[PDB]
Amino acid sequence: ASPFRLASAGEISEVQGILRTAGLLGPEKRIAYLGVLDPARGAGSEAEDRRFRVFIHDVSGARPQEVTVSVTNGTVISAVELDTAATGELPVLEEEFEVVEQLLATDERWLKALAARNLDVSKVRVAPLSAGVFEYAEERGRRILRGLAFVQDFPEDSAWAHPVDGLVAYVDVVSKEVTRVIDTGVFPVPAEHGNYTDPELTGPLRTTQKPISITQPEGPSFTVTGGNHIEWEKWSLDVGFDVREGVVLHNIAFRDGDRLRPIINRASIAEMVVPYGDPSPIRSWQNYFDTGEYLVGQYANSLELGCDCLGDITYLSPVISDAFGNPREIRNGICMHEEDWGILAKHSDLWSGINYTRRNRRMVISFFTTIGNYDYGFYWYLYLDGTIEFEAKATGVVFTSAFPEGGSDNISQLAPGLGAPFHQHIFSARLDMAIDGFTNRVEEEDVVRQTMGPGNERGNAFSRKRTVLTRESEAVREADARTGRTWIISNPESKNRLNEPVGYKLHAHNQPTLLADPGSSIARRAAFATKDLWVTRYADDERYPTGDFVNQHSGGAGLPSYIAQDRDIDGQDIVVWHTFGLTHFPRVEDWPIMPVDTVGFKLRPEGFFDRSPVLDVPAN
Amino acid sequence: ASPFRLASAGEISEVQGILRTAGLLGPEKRIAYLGVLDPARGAGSEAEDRRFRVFIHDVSGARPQEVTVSVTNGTVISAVELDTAATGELPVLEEEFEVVEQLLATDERWLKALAARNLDVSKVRVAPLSAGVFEYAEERGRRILRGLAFVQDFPEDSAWAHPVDGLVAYVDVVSKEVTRVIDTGVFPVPAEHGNYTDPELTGPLRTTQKPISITQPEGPSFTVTGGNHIEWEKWSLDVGFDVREGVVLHNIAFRDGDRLRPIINRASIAEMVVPYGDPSPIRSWQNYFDTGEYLVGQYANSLELGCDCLGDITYLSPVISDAFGNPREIRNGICMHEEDWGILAKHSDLWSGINYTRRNRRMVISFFTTIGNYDYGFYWYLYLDGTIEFEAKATGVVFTSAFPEGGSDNISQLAPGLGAPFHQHIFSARLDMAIDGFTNRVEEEDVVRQTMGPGNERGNAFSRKRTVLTRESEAVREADARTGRTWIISNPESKNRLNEPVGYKLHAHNQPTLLADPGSSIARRAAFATKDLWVTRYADDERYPTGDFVNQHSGGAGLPSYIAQDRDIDGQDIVVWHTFGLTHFPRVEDWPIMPVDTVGFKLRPEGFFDRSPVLDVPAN
């Protein structure tokens, strides 16, 4: 019955049928995006209306459409033709990935470039890379991908070991034309292989690892009902999945005594961008919005038992649309399990003689996606004590280049002649807050040092201050690690037993934000990434920090336009957007396959509960 | 045979015998500190000399002594009388804990204070708190403890629920005199109990947690030899234990191919301080140096299987001296186990068709200690990929006070009338570095933003800079989270295959450092805590950031005096001292027993290896 249930294969085929019936999905049409819409606010006694949002591309060059369908009612609610030069191109289609290499393989300029480097065209892979928005006027309103080349010596070879630097091509994937081929000069193609399953490179595999066995003989402590409704150790939520955002959590709530207390209405990673910091013209345009441009959900891995996810695992297998509107299952695409998390609380009291130890656990909801060379794990954690955490795990193969003779300020060396351009991976978490309901506010909390003097004669006092962010113009905030800055989301109308507003505190990692010059194209397109925290008033159409259409789309949409409205956020339905990222200067240890690195954030209860919420956890 | 082996019961009894034989351990003498000394540098072909350092207190009022004994040779190497007014008092003796309450129980001023509050003296516990150094001239050269009172309603009651505010006493624990009783006025003693095993407060215990079983059917992948030498997944180290510092790691090295490569010579938590930020005269003197004043190792818990440490656990049971020089075993005081740590590396490659996943693991070496209300877990982690990490887990019961009518800028409310003064927990990790041997240097690495302009026309470039810290005067550094500041320890004489010095990068959490006014007593006594990173030239007598004697000891010793020497640290035997801490504004959720909170740091290889060191980890 849940209006938050995962999309079924049947609903997707039904959307297909409705669009077909309506004349919107003929043979030249392709689905670039399809997802279920969340229920509107209120929607109390009102019967459910499952609605789907669809972006439809036309391979014949006609304008794309944005369409909303009611699958419940079998109707098209709205359909509007898009002017992509204005509002943005549709997300990259998986079918376009191969097109760059295919078109380049018969282009005389490309072939001349490959011949100058003595490279067999049959061995040259071309990465289909998002184009962004630069100085090329002819690209405006055209679907462009840019291609960087990598040599694959044999079918199972890692092409990333062999970048072809000094060469880039631009391609119109609809008209199927190569617009530009730029060759700035030959660089040596790095020769060492990067084949991490080749015994010559690995050496003899370790025989020293003894097995670890994690089992739950009575099964897991969480229940799954209605397909995706999770109940675990007082927590309640629904696990959604969207082809753009990936795993989305809905209705995160905690059962405190008899009462189900909302905390977060919707949590997602609403954007992620990977800006590169190499000023070479071969790569200076490189910024991958994995979520907005490529749709991370679409590329979610099927996760193998005892390998990707260890322990007693419950899987969800979300269904997505292919390019024609047929359902496609991502088998075992979401892992759900609980795990031990060390000591929760411990005290050995001299005076009472009582020794007390309790163990912690967390519920884990995760998926892993692959886009080209990159592989990212997205992990949501719920802890016994009320803490909510997100962690991203970045791995894969580093994006490579040549390593310049005489070195580089913007590229590190991985292997002889092999470079790795500096870059960042920056995420935006969109947290549609509902601390004890929708009436919320945000305060910025800083530690306050105090001067030795009257009232502080020993010079030991310290304090803190909280500043309420009252309107959206005041709610674009930066980190201040030195002063221990955090942000508290509270409900001014819901007080704990000590008469203080209930709240949750967001703890950031305070990693660097977007490094690009503020006048760059990427600083405008990824404006969200320039500041650590934004707070907006909730609106149904403010979904992504970069707007609905990111591909080849300039500034003009997203967070900077949302906050211009300068809406009241002091005791209102609000949304927190937290920017957090990794800044990567690749090291030799990242090659030939990168060990996981992590980044994230957490929210901890801050006077939400009337005392510790884990007093009822049993011993041992 | 290892000169780094744990002290045996026999060695301790032998030290006792040598001191006795030498006339240094008569009936009025007490051992306040006893520990094995590390081998001197070089000590190659030279036969082993196990030496012990002892601080001897005299209960009759005579001056204490510092003594070094050769247990191998049965000799006293040196014995020197200490002037405590100058160099500091000896650490607090466990036998002195009870003395404060005992002396106060027959003092007429104390009894008057208790009677004014209608408190039964038999029910009043007194915390034996370190005194520090303030304005009281008569305390100089005297062993003083200060006492704060807490009511215990019955034998199993948590006294921390019932602080007696407005009252403090100072006591000379040698002459057995109460020097001062200060009563600033009555406060209500908070009435609610804080008994977290009482069913009335917990409610019915959860029946929802299904078991998690962690087993290793073939046993653990690490070996223990010589009592405390660990070998695990290419790592090699010796696990030491000292009554002051607790678990100390020696000779951390990694077997890279055929060659055992040193990384860290000695790693310890060399100090930890808990400064309180309440300007009330009842607590404004409160700063607990758990390591330096109380000796954290001494209070290490015996850790129960399947409770404190879960999985296939190997224990060490370190031996310490009691006050008379008799050995005392801390049964199961150190836990050692390996655990799964999620995905290590993963890539699913479109072009090669190869899908690759490997799992991570870490070796964990831990102990847990209790000092009064506080309980701290100290965890060292070694990861497959070469990462070394430390984590402290803080739990226990928060130190309480009254909560003032009309509120407080320096105390939070936990329960009706119950306060928790703001405070910090600040650690110093002493890392005697040995990156590929002893010839090391430290660089500070900051991210460098670049301006859009010539050479960076798109405004995307970013870089980094490294500054070598050449002399100790230049090596007192602060965090800069905004610029992603880290510190790299490298060996300028050992290059990787890419001709770059091998190194490790220290990643800090960039939490606030000591908040107290710089003119305070605590800013001088805990000077180390005012800055994030110090680098010194190694010296055998520079062990602690606060010097050898912290108790009632002013500034004058420790890190500020070490660096005045302004020694060369550019390619020399160096020591990194990293300050890191938690700043705690207690929340209602911390009451009546605190969920674990964590802080720490890690070091990751930075061009130490010639490629990923985990290419030889097997599948599944």
Ligand SMILES: [Cu+2]
């Ligand atoms: Cu990266």
Ligand SMILES: [Cu+2]
């Ligand atoms: Cu604390």
Ligand code: NA
């Ligand atoms: Na909201």
Ligand code: NA
């Ligand atoms: Na050293």
